[PDB]
Design a protein around this motif. Structure first.
Motif, PDB file in Angstrom:
ATOM      1  N   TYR A 196      -6.497  16.225  -8.467  1.00  0.00           N
ATOM      2  CA  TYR A 196      -5.296  16.133  -9.342  1.00  0.00           C
ATOM      3  C   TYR A 196      -4.323  17.258  -8.977  1.00  0.00           C
ATOM      4  O   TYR A 196      -3.979  18.092  -9.828  1.00  0.00           O
ATOM      5  N   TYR A 222      -1.320  12.289  -8.691  1.00  0.00           N
ATOM      6  CA  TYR A 222      -2.634  11.614  -8.506  1.00  0.00           C
ATOM      7  C   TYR A 222      -3.056  11.731  -7.025  1.00  0.00           C
ATOM      8  O   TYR A 222      -3.006  10.768  -6.263  1.00  0.00           O
ATOM      9  N   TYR A 240      -4.383   8.138  -5.568  1.00  0.00           N
ATOM     10  CA  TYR A 240      -5.030   7.126  -6.436  1.00  0.00           C
ATOM     11  C   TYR A 240      -4.034   6.699  -7.504  1.00  0.00           C
ATOM     12  O   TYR A 240      -4.445   6.252  -8.580  1.00  0.00           O
ATOM     13  N   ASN A 257      -5.673  13.997  -4.233  1.00  0.00           N
ATOM     14  CA  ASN A 257      -6.883  14.794  -3.961  1.00  0.00           C
ATOM     15  C   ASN A 257      -6.851  15.260  -2.507  1.00  0.00           C
ATOM     16  O   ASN A 257      -6.216  14.609  -1.672  1.00  0.00           O
ATOM     17  N   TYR A 301      -7.686  16.122   4.693  1.00  0.00           N
ATOM     18  CA  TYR A 301      -7.125  14.796   4.336  1.00  0.00           C
ATOM     19  C   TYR A 301      -6.650  14.811   2.901  1.00  0.00           C
ATOM     20  O   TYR A 301      -7.385  15.293   2.033  1.00  0.00           O
ATOM     21  N   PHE A 340      -5.417   7.393   2.314  1.00  0.00           N
ATOM     22  CA  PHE A 340      -5.537   8.771   2.825  1.00  0.00           C
ATOM     23  C   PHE A 340      -4.422   9.056   3.823  1.00  0.00           C
ATOM     24  O   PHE A 340      -3.959   8.147   4.573  1.00  0.00           O
ATOM     25  N   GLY A 341      -4.030  10.326   3.912  1.00  0.00           N
ATOM     26  CA  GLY A 341      -3.169  10.747   5.008  1.00  0.00           C
ATOM     27  C   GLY A 341      -3.935  10.702   6.314  1.00  0.00           C
ATOM     28  O   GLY A 341      -5.161  10.541   6.288  1.00  0.00           O
ATOM     29  N   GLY A 342      -3.256  10.939   7.429  1.00  0.00           N
ATOM     30  CA  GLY A 342      -3.863  10.822   8.766  1.00  0.00           C
ATOM     31  C   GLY A 342      -4.659  12.055   9.125  1.00  0.00           C
ATOM     32  O   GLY A 342      -5.304  12.063  10.183  1.00  0.00           O
ATOM     33  N   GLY A 343      -4.604  13.105   8.311  1.00  0.00           N
ATOM     34  CA  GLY A 343      -5.412  14.305   8.560  1.00  0.00           C
ATOM     35  C   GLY A 343      -4.645  15.394   9.312  1.00  0.00           C
ATOM     36  O   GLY A 343      -3.747  15.092  10.118  1.00  0.00           O
ATOM     37  N   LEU A 353      -4.132   1.158  -6.321  1.00  0.00           N
ATOM     38  CA  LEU A 353      -5.113   0.582  -5.379  1.00  0.00           C
ATOM     39  C   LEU A 353      -4.324  -0.171  -4.322  1.00  0.00           C
ATOM     40  O   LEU A 353      -3.274  -0.698  -4.610  1.00  0.00           O
ATOM     41  N   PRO A 354      -4.766  -0.173  -3.055  1.00  0.00           N
ATOM     42  CA  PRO A 354      -5.969   0.572  -2.672  1.00  0.00           C
ATOM     43  C   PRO A 354      -5.713   2.081  -2.546  1.00  0.00           C
ATOM     44  O   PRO A 354      -4.576   2.487  -2.224  1.00  0.00           O
ATOM     45  N   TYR A 355      -6.738   2.893  -2.792  1.00  0.00           N
ATOM     46  CA  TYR A 355      -6.720   4.316  -2.381  1.00  0.00           C
ATOM     47  C   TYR A 355      -6.320   4.375  -0.898  1.00  0.00           C
ATOM     48  O   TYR A 355      -6.777   3.554  -0.083  1.00  0.00           O
ATOM     49  N   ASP A 408       0.872  -1.182   0.000  1.00  0.00           N
ATOM     50  CA  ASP A 408       0.000   0.000   0.000  1.00  0.00           C
ATOM     51  C   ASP A 408       0.901   1.221   0.000  1.00  0.00           C
ATOM     52  O   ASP A 408       1.938   1.158   0.620  1.00  0.00           O
TER      53      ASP A 408
END
Lengths: 214, 227
Positions: free
Chosen positions: A50, A32, A91, A34, A87, A98-101, A94-96, A1
Motif C-alpha cells: 500500500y 494500491y 491491485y 506493492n 518489481y 507488475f512493472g518490468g523490473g 484485475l488483473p494484477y 489492463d
C-alpha cells in the motif's frame, strides 16, 4: 489492463548511496501499489505494501512513496545484499499487473579478473569432444572480452560464455568461456590460449597450456 | 515459519497437461487466499489468478482462462495449478503465493513459494556428465588457486551443484547454464582459494539433476605442475 512501467530497467549506485526506483501506472491506481524484491537466486519477497508500509523483516533503509500514477521505492543507504530486481505491482483492478523490473547493481572500484585455463579431461576426450574452459574470477566492471587462440589462430563461432550475477559481498562478476572442438580437431593443435581484455588489467592477459606438456 | 513448498522441476510434452503443487505450512491454509504468478526466463512477473481455499472460488487473468486451473486439497493444506495444451511459451517458473489482507481492501502477496520450473519439450531427459576442471599448472605468484566441475550435456534445467556436501561455499561460483546447439545444457561450477589455503582440503562437487534422478559426487584432483 493497467500497464505498469519501470522507466529505468537497470540502476548502478555506490554502497551508502541513496537509490530511488520509479514505477508509473497507465492510469491512477490510488496508492494500491506493492513492491517485491527478487534476489539473483530467484527468491521473491514482499518489501512494501500500500505504497509505504514495510513488510515483516524489511530494514528501515527501505521506504516507499507516491500517489496517482507515480511511485518511488527508496533505499536510503545501499548495502551489497540489496543486489536484486525490484518489481512494482498494482491491485487497483484485475488483473494484477507488475512493472518490468529494475535491476540494482553496486558501483565499486575497478577490479581485474584472475584468469585460469582448464584443459579438457581424458574422461571427456575419450567420448569424442574437448571442452576448454577459461575462468575470469571476481572482476568489476562487467564488460570483458575473451578471445580464444589455438596455435595463435583466433577462434570464432566455437565458444559460449556465461557470467554470474553480482556477488552480494564483494560486488564482483565472474565469467566462464567454453571452447568446444571435436577430439580430432583438438589433437591437431598444441597451444590453447584465452586472451582477456578488461579495464582493471594493464594490457591484455593470456593464459595458455600446450597439450604436449599437460 | 510461513512456508510454501512447491513441487520439483517438471519436463512435459507439448499438447499435454502438468499439475504443480504448493504445500503450505506455518499458518492455517483455509484462512488465506492463494495467488499464482508466472515468470518466463529473463522476463517480468505475470499474475495468473487467485483461489479462496475455503470454498474453491477462483479469479483468473483472462490471458490464462484457457491455460490454468487452480484447485485446493484442504486435508493436505496443498494448492494445485494445472496447465493444459502446453507449448514452449508455457516453459517458465510458476510461483504460488499467499495473499494477506490489511484493513478493508489492502492486499499483497506476503509469502512466496520457491517456484517450480516447467520445461515444455519433445526431447528426452538426459542426466549430465561431470568432468574435472583442473589447471595444467599453478604460478608461485598467483594469490588464488582455481578448480571446478564441467556439468555437460543435460536436459532439462535445472541442476544444483554443491562442494564438499555444502561445507564449502566461500569462493564458489556456479555459472548460469548455456543452451548448446545440440539442445543440451552445459554449466561450470568453480572454486577459488587463497593459494596458501589450497592444500588444507580436498574438493568434491556434488551434482543433482532431479529431472533424471542423477546425483554425481566428483572429486577434482588437486595435483598440478609448477610453471
Amino acid at each position: 489492463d493497467i500497464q505498469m512501467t519501470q522507466t529505468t530497467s537497470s540502476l548502478s549506485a555506490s554502497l551508502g548511496d541513496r537509490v530511488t526506483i520509479t514505477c508509473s501506472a497507465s492510469q491512477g491506481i490510488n496508492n494500491y501499489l506493492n513492491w517485491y524484491q527478487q534476489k539473483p537466486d530467484g527468491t521473491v519477497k514482499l518489501l512494501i505494501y500500500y505504497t509505504s508500509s514495510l513488510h515483516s523483516g524489511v530494514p528501515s533503509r527501505f521506504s516507499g512513496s507516491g500517489s496517482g500514477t507515480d511511485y518511488s521505492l527508496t533505499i536510503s543507504n545501499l548495502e551489497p545484499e540489496d543486489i536484486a530486481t525490484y518489481y512494482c505491482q498494482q491491485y487497483s483492478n484485475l488483473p494484477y499487473t507488475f512493472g518490468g523490473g529494475t535491476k540494482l547493481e553496486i558501483k565499486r572500484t575497478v577490479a581485474a579478473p584472475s584468469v585460469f585455463i582448464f584443459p579438457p579431461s581424458d574422461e571427456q576426450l575419450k567420448s569424442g569432444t574437448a571442452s576448454v574452459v577459461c575462468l575470469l574470477n571476481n572482476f568489476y566492471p562487467r564488460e570483458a572480452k575473451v578471445q580464444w587462440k589455438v596455435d595463435n589462430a583466433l577462434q570464432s563461432g566455437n565458444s559460449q560464455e556465461s557470467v554470474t550475477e553480482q556477488d552480494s559481498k564483494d560486488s564482483t562478476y565472474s565469467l566462464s568461456s567454453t571452447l568446444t572442438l571435436s577430439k580430432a580437431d583438438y589433437e591437431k593443435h598444441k597451444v590453447y590460449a584465452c586472451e582477456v581484455t578488461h579495464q582493471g588489467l594493464s594490457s591484455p592477459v593470456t593464459k595458455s597450456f600446450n597439450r604436449g606438456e599437460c | 515459519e510461513v512456508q510454501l513448498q512447491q513441487s520439483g522441476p517438471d519436463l512435459v510434452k507439448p499438447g499435454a497437461s502438468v499439475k504443480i503443487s504448493c504445500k503450505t505450512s506455518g499458518y492455517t491454509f483455509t484462512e488465506y487466499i492463494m495467488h499464482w504468478v508466472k515468470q518466463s526466463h529473463g522476463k517480468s512477473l505475470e499474475w495468473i489468478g487467485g483461489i479462496i481455499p475455503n470454498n474453491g472460488g477462483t479469479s483468473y487473468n483472462q490471458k490464462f482462462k484457457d491455460k490454468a486451473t487452480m484447485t485446493v486439497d484442504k486435508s493436505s493444506s496443498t494448492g494445485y495449478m494445472e496447465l493444459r495444451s502446453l507449448t514452449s511459451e508455457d516453459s517458465a517458473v510458476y510461483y504460488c503465493t499467499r495473499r494477506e489482507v490489511y484493513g478493508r481492501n489492502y492486499y499483497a502477496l506476503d509469502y512466496w513459494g520457491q517456484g517450480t520450473l516447467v520445461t515444455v519439450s519433445s526431447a528426452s531427459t538426459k542426466g549430465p556428465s561431470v568432468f574435472p576442471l583442473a589447471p595444467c599448472s599453478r604460478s608461485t605468484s598467483e594469490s588464488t588457486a582455481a578448480l571446478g566441475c564441467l556439468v555437460k550435456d543435460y536436459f532439462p534445467e535445472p541442476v544444483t551443484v554443491s562442494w564438499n556436501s555444502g561445507a564449502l561455499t566461500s569462493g564458489v561460483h556456479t555459472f548460469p547454464a548455456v543452451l548448446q546447439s545440440s539442445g543440451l545444457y552445459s554449466l561450470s561450477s568453480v572454486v577459488t582459494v587463497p593459494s596458501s589455503n589450497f592444500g588444507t582440503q580436498t574438493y568434491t562437487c556434488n551434482v543433482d539433476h532431479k529431472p533424471s534422478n542423477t546425483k554425481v559426487d566428483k572429486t577434482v584432483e588437486r595435483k598440478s605442475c609448477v610453471e
